[PDB]
Amino acid sequence: ALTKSQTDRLEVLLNPKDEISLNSGKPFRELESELLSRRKKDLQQIYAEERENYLGKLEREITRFFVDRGFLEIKSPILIPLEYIERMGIDNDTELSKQIFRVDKNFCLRPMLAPNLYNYLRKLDRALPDPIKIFEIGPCYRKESDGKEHLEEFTMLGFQQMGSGCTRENLESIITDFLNHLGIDFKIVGGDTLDVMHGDLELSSAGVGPIPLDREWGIDKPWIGAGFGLERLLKVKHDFKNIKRAARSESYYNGISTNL
Amino acid sequence: ALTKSQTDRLEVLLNPKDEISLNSGKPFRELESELLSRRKKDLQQIYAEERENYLGKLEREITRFFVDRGFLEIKSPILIPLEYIERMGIDNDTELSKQIFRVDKNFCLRPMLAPNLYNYLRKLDRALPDPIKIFEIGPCYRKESDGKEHLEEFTMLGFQQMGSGCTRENLESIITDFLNHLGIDFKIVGGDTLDVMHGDLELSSAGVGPIPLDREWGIDKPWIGAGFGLERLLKVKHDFKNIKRAARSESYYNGISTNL
Ligand SMILES: Nc1ncnc2c1ncn2[C@@H]1O[C@H](COP(=O)(O)OP(=O)(O)NP(=O)(O)O)[C@@H](O)[C@H]1O
Ligand SMILES: Nc1ncnc2c1ncn2[C@@H]1O[C@H](COP(=O)(O)OP(=O)(O)NP(=O)(O)O)[C@@H](O)[C@H]1O
Ligand SMILES: N[C@@H](Cc1csc2ccccc12)C(=O)O
Ligand SMILES: N[C@@H](Cc1csc2ccccc12)C(=O)O
Ligand SMILES: [Mg+2]
Ligand SMILES: [Mg+2]
Ligand SMILES: [Mg+2]
Ligand SMILES: [Mg+2]
């Protein structure tokens, strides 16, 4: 009989597509040797053939998808003024206030893309024709309780369109085309707001403006937008049991354990 | 005569390829109106035609270049244990110790890619055939004095090869092919170490191992590697006078002022 410690070890080495039962009559040492051999070969095949990281490749695919639909690619600061958090309406009553990684007296690791995207919408409205369509992909940071669906360091896609065409129907069409393009199953459930669910897992929250918060950011036009976690998309696509297999990590490469 | 404040404002709106003299007999208001019109049209052309961010696009081009040469694409944590810094031999005597953005009691924003790349080399050596070639592109953080060549939030390329073929000649060949591919002029000047210079500007530091530090990271094979700042490459390629035009920013998009 395997110990729970031994089964923990085998589960680290187990890939979703593996056809192995750890409840068999096989000794730990030889189940482990089998899985070690398979994972080494998996890494060898990646190194020989494609060599691209899941998170980088997904960012590049998403980037191509939004650029092709007319959205401008933004890369804004990850280290942001703490003031931006308060100006988003996040006060101690809100959950997110206690999730902030503070850095100095006045700065934090951004937990969200909305402040920077607001600032870009306001500035670009002076230069670009209506409608203004922008997106960003990059690191975001939140303190979280241990969870199979949460990372403290994750990667967010945020997109926003401002001006004409900012209907709920158009927002749902973007989301739907996007997830059908990636091959990810979803249901949309719904200051209009909606969530994009995969079972009980939240892939995205989306919104339709105007909302009263817009005025603090110098925004006075309708808008639609949404934010998606890349690691949650990878977790669904590859059927990972824990989102740590999709994270920036020293412990996993493309969902394969690096502790061999 | 223009005030220095007025010339500061015009210089924000001035692009390197602009054929305008601020030392002319033209009034500020109409020099400003001219440059505002040009910068709005520049942004309009980006939005109409390509829509890609300089920093994202450069990362993707570099990524294609190293993947095609057989390097595995790594995406490792940006928030790293503070311990990694000490284990790199960075003590109070070294300059970098006081440049660290600390986050909690035990974590920091990585100022460098070497710790994570060391850990990947050690782990992948159990699985991959000799030689082991890896690279990473992503955010790094250092506290710096105000400078035309330094950002506190920048983007690093780091690559490393371990095992056979780890000669200085091979390292110089990679660097040379890489910068000739990007169209960036350079001179290589030289525990063997060398710097890749563009005039007085350091594009890269590179190294040849083994070095004694390797043992602390579980490394006991020869290696070659280098690190490059992406914003410095953009600054050179686009002839920006200040590296802030190439940064993750709310103030510049592809080197164009967003304050129009
Ligand atoms: N800690 C996290 N780890 C991974 N992805 C995350 C995390 N927090 C948010 N995301 C993703 O970012 C999207 C937009 O953020 P947001 O709507 O603020 O999330 P949220 O409401 O806190 N979701 P949740 O914490 O799961 O109830 C989410 O739908 C997730 O896909
Ligand atoms: N603050 C920074 N802003 C932008 N790029 C940077 C910064 N620090 C380092 N880099 C880049 O990263 C490369 C490798 O880092 P490193 O060799 O540690 O730099 P460095 O020795 O501190 N260079 P410098 O500070 O200019 O004398 C450098 O050659 C630069 O291209
Ligand atoms: N609130 C999260 C997700 C998000 C980015 S743009 C955006 C627009 C509408 C809804 C959500 C988002 C965030 O601010 O990152
Ligand atoms: N020291 C910097 C640059 C770098 C990355 S891998 C590497 C290998 C050799 C020399 C430099 C580097 C760093 O650690 O990021
Ligand atoms: Mg949450
Ligand atoms: Mg949500
Ligand atoms: Mg320095
Ligand atoms: Mg150096």
What does this structure look like?
Chains A, B: Catalyzes the attachment of pyrrolysine to tRNA(Pyl). Pyrrolysine is a lysine derivative encoded by the termination codon UAG. Chains A, B: One of its GO terms (biological process) is tRNA aminoacylation for protein translation. Chains A, B: Its EC number is 6.1.1.26. Chains A, B: This is Pyrrolysine--tRNA ligase. Chains A, B: It is found in: Cytoplasm. The structure is a homodimer of 260-residue chains. Chain A is α+β, with helices and mostly antiparallel strands and 260 residues long. The first copy, chain A, folds into two domains: 1-51, Helix hairpin bin (Helix Hairpins, Orthogonal Bundle), CATH 1.10.287; 52-260, 2-Layer Sandwich (BirA Bifunctional Protein, domain 2), CATH 3.30.930. In chain A, 33% of the residues lie in helices and 23% in strands. Chain A has seven helices and twelve strands. Chain A has helices at 4-13, 28-49, 54-68, 83-87, 114-124, 168-182, 230-238; strands at residues 72-74, 79-81, 101-102, 107-109, 132-141, 153-162, 187-189, 192-198, 201-209, 223-229, 252-253, 256-257. In chain A, the strands form three sheets. Chain A has a seven-stranded mixed sheet with strand order 1-5-6-10-9-8-7, with helices on both faces. A three-stranded antiparallel sheet of chain A has the order 2-4-3. In chain A, β7 and β8 form a beta hairpin. At the A-B interface, α2, α3, β1 and α5 of A face α2, α3, β1 and α5 of B. The complex binds phosphoaminophosphonic acid-adenylate ester (ANP) (2 copies), 3-(1-benzothiophen-3-yl)-L-alanine (4OG) (2 copies) and magnesium ion (4 copies). Residues 202, 205 of chain A line the site of one magnesium ion.
